[model samples]
Each structure stands twice: as C-alpha cells, then as structure tokens.
Target: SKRALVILAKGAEEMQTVIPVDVMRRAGIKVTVAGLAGKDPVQCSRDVVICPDASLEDAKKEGPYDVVVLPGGNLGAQNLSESAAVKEILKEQENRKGLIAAICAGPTALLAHEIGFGSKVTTHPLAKDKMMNGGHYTYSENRVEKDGLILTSRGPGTSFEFALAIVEALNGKEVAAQVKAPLVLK
Candidate 1:
C-alpha cells in the first residue's frame, strides 16, 4: 500500500488536515498524522484538537512516503516554515522525486524550505503574496494544481479536490473515481 505523511502542527487548518487524512484513507492509502511538535494533541486554528498518530521524529524514521502533505493555517504554516526538520524532510523528498502536496498557506512552508522552487502552485488567496515572495514558483488560482511532483491547492473548500488529486497520482484514475463516487461530489 502507498504511504502518506501528513505533518500536523498547532493551529493547522482542521478541515485541510482531516479531509485529506480521511479521503486518502478511503482511497486505501496508509496515512500517518504525525505531530510536528511531538507526539501530542494539537490545537487547530478552529480550536479543534487532534492527537497525532506519531511524532514527526518517529515518522521520519519510517519514511520515504509516497506523498508528504502539508495543511495550512497562518500560524501553522509559520511554524512549519521555521522548522529545520521540515526543511530536511522536504528537501530529501524533493531529491527523491516523491510527491509533495500543500494547501492554502501550506505552500508558503515549501517556499521557506526552498523546495520545488519552479513548480506551478496555488494557495489560499490570502497567502498569494507570501507564497510569491521570492518569485520562485509560478502562481495559479485553480482550486488544485499539480506541477510534476509538487501538488498544491487553494483553501479548505478545495481539500477534497486536493486529496483526490493525491489519490489519482498514487492509485490511478480508476481508484480515484471509485473513491470519489461515494463522496457525492459534483
């Protein structure tokens, strides 16, 4: 089975985090909700709390995952952007040509780590300025955008599309369609 690593941080967007974790699991992907701060419950931007399946330190030992997912919230992305561990993980994943997916402000973290600098990407409209800070990546307004191994999406409203894109990338069109059918998506 394909594996995914979802780095969970304090103030992360709850919908962005949960939607992908749920949708990817529905697609038969082994998804790990790894706490970036350590193995503990994390408080999200909406005040929802989630307990991680493992600490990122431990999760890193179990990698190289098929995909690495980054959820967004202003503070959450800030924390991720400042983490040296995240930088190393992203750099290694990029070097290995593994998939890296981000949403909303999440893509800003990618910019901080200097990963996929030339990929076409998208983020929440509010994050466009921050993500485009250095003119490293081409920006898009599409709900979901996948440029090579670097995948990105807009905001919470696009979480389903983002998750499904990851599914299609890893499991193919048939599995993606099968998974999407039950969601009653338009």
Candidate 2:
C-alpha cells in the first residue's frame, strides 16, 4: 500500500493538512501526520488543534514512504523550513524520485531546503516574494501545479484539489475519482 508523510508544524493550515489527510485515506493510502515539534497536539494557524500520529523523529525511522506533503501556513512553513530534519527528508525524497507536495506558503519551505528548484511551482499569492527568493523556481498562478515529483497548490481553497492530485499521483485517476465521489466538490 502507498504511504505518505505529512510534516505538521505549529501554524500549519488546518484545512490544508486535514483535507489532504482525509482525502488520501479515502484513496486507501496509509497517511501519517507527523508532528515536527513533538507528539503533543499542534496548534494550527487558526488555532485548530490537531494531534499527530507520531513525532517526526520517530516517523523518520518508519519511512521511505511514497510521498511527503507540506501544508501551507506562513509561520508553519517557517517552522518547517527551519527544521534540519525536514531538509533531510526532502533531500532523501528527491534523491529517490518520490513525490514531494506542498501548498501555499509551504513551497517556501521547499525553497528553503532547495528542493524542486527547477520545477514550475505555485504558492499563496501573498507568499510570492518569499517563494521567488533568488528567482530559482518558476511561479504559477495555478490552483494546483505538478512538475515531475513536486506538486503544489495555491491556498486553503485548493486543498481538496491538492490532495486529490496526490491521490492521482500515488494511486490513479480512477482511484482519485472514486475517492472524491462522495465528498463535496466542484
């Protein structure tokens, strides 16, 4: 079965994290929401508390997973970018050609870690300046953009699309369609 690692830090977008996690599960993937800080509940950007399945340090030993996801919330991206562990995770994932997905300001963390530098990417509109630092990556106004193994989305409004994109990548279009059929969508 496919598995995913979602690195959750304080200030992560609650919707971005939860929507993807839920959608992936519906696609029959084993999803792990790993806490960057520790096992304690994380307070999202909007103050929604989410308890992670495990701490990142512990999850590290269990992974060589199919994908790693980064959820966008400015401060959360900052925390993720600052983590040495996240850099290592992204580096290894890139080396293995595994999928690495991010949304909104979350792509800024990719910039910080120097992952997906040559890919076409997108982020929350307000985060353009930060994402374009050094002019390394090409930016997009897309709701969801996939460049090779790197997938990115715009913002809270795009979480479902982003998650379904991951499902399509790891599973298949048929699976993604089946998974979303029962949900609210466009």
Per-residue lDDT tens digits for candidate 2, residues 35-152, read 9999899999999999999999999889899999999999999999999999999999999999999998999999999998889999999999999989999989999999999999
Model 2 misplaced stretches (Cα beyond 4 Å): none
lDDT of 1: 0.96
Candidate 1, residues 1-186, lDDT tens digits: the string is 999999999999999999999999999999999999999999999999999999999999999999999999999999899999899999999999999999999999999999999889999999999999979999999999999999999999999999999999999999999999999998
Q: Relative to the true structure, how large is the alpha-carbon lDDT of every model?
A: 0.96, 0.95
Alpha carbon lDDT at 59, candidate 1: 97
Alpha-carbon deviation at 127 in model 1, angstroms = 0.3
Candidate 2 residue 55 C-alpha distance from true site, Å: 0.3
C-alpha lDDT of candidate 2 relative to the true structure: 0.95
